[PDB]
């Protein structure tokens, strides 16, 4: 079993980017996308099972 991990140089920066996209969207400069709620997805996708 060999675990070779490939990491790109700005991982921790991107991690912050993942957050301040939400915490201050304006000073973010992050790619923009359609929220999953507004996509053609099954109703289950947002109601967890019982």
């Amino acid at each position: 079993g060999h675990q070779i991990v490939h990491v790109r140089g700005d991982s921790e920066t991107d991690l912050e980017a993942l957050f301040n996209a939400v915490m201050n969207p304006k000073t973010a400069n992050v790619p923009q996308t359609v929220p999953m709620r507004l996509r053609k997805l099954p109703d289950s996708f947002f109601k967890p099972p019982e």
Binding site: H2, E12, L18, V30
Partner: protein
């Protein structure tokens, strides 16, 4: 019935172990499988990397019935002890009827780019008359561990869910010798608010 006859994912588990002292052991599961509706794969193409060996390139490269979308409600309700060494790991078990060299690639993707790719090579083990490939206590990347910590300190879960909007994991298991896609599992996450525990919906990916 997750996976094809070529290779069947029967077990998946990401966890935190904690050793407060020599008499104390704790284990917390974040998500777990193994303890169907369909989704148009084009709807989730704007959430995964679709470049060389991308969820799109692989779809046509191998069997479409090997592709799956999993929505996880992760269980983040775990008291991280500050005085205890902690192992963050991922145990996944795959069972197959044939003996092949198996390579599992786990990629954490932010927006359209995969930040970290981990490649694990596994070999067939004969158990109960079948060949079983199992990754035992594989360590998660510092990125994932930091991500969990950064999520925790968010005050509300709706904030957690919002950052998870742009977070995905692509899991691709492949026959190393033939480069045939054995199983591909695209992963999307919210944070489970259920008291009982982590929940998960599995969908088969299709095109139209």
């Amino acid at each position: 019935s997750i996976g094809t006859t070529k290779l069947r994912l029967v077990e998946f588990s990401a966890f935190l172990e904690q050793q407060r002292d020599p008499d104390s052991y704790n284990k917390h599961l974040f998500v777990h499988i193994g303890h169907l509706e369909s989704v148009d794969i084009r709807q989730i193409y704007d959430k995964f990397p679709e470049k060389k060996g991308g969820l799109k390139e692989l779809f046509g490269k191998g069997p479409q019935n090997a592709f799956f979308l999993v929505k996880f409600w992760a269980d983040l309700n775990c008291n991280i002890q500050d005085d205890a060494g902690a192992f963050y790991g991922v145990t996944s078990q795959y069972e197959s009827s044939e003996n092949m060299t198996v390579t599992c690639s786990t990629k954490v993707c932010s927006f359209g780019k995969q930040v970290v790719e981990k490649v694990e090579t596994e070999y067939a083990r004969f158990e109960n008359g079948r060949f079983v490939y199992r990754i035992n206590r594989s360590p998660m990347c510092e990125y994932m561990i930091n991500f969990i910590h950064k999520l925790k300190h968010l005050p509300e879960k709706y904030m957690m869910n919002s950052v998870l909007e742009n977070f995905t994991i692509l899991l691709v298991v492949t026959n190393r010798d033939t480069q045939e896609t054995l199983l591909c599992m695209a992963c999307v996450f919210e944070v489970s608010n259920s008291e009982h525990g982590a929940q998960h919906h599995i969908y088969r990916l299709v095109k139209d």
